[PDB]
Amino acid sequence: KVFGRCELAAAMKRHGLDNYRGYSLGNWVCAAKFESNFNTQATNRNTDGSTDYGILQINSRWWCNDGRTPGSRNLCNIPCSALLSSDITASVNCAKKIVSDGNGMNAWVAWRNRCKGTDVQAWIRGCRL
Ligand SMILES: [Cl-]
Ligand SMILES: [Cl-]
Ligand code: NA
């Protein structure tokens, strides 16, 4: 599914991401925009053989099992395919663990390069929560 911007903000807000670990809702919308273009079905293969999955491009090296990433961990304890559902609950729950691990949202390369230090509040303006 391809989310609308406000639609996604509302879904993220319901799942407790607004100000989760100090990151306002605009940060998460911005990250999803540039990681996946708001597409829950997005996949991208990394050079090391791992693959990124879903709306926040969560990586099979550490976070999910795709059965084809030798020597990897499954820290969110889920198959990587569950991160491709139109229900975003699994992505959000895994993202909360990732963002708590010490590096905050710097784990998402697009966020660090394209959202960090910008007016992220712009991403939720005009939205009905
Ligand atoms: Cl929308
Ligand atoms: Cl894995
Ligand atoms: Na932080």
Side-chain angles (χ1 to χ4, degrees):
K1 156 173 194 186
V2 185
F3 274 83
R5 172 178 64 91
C6 293
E7 183 185 20
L8 181 60
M12 285 178 156
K13 190 174 169 58
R14 194 171 72 85
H15 289 290
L17 281 187
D18 195 0
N19 278 125
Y20 191 83
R21 291 282 177 189
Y23 293 93
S24 63
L25 198 52
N27 286 288
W28 301 98
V29 175
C30 184
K33 171 55 157 156
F34 296 125
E35 289 291 342
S36 73
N37 205 40
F38 303 145
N39 184 7
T40 66
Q41 294 201 73
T43 63
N44 292 284
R45 175 65 33 74
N46 300 315
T47 58
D48 67 341
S50 64
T51 304
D52 293 357
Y53 293 91
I55 195 130
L56 287 164
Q57 288 294 274
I58 289 169
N59 187 333
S60 66
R61 180 56 182 75
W62 305 100
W63 303 108
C64 60
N65 181 50
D66 63 8
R68 52 156 293 164
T69 309
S72 63
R73 306 306 310 283
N74 189 1
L75 287 173
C76 294
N77 272 110
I78 48 99
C80 299
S81 64
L83 300 168
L84 302 179
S85 167
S86 55
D87 185 344
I88 65 163
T89 302
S91 284
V92 171
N93 290 345
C94 186
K96 288 175 171 164
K97 297 218 181 79
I98 295 167
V99 75
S100 305
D101 81 12
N103 294 351
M105 286 199 74
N106 288 303
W108 286 279
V109 171
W111 180 82
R112 185 174 70 269
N113 291 145
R114 310 186 65 175
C115 303
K116 187 173 189 178
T118 69
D119 184 358
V120 291
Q121 309 187 269
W123 292 95
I124 62 175
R125 283 214 289 281
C127 299
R128 179 152 273 287
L129 292 90

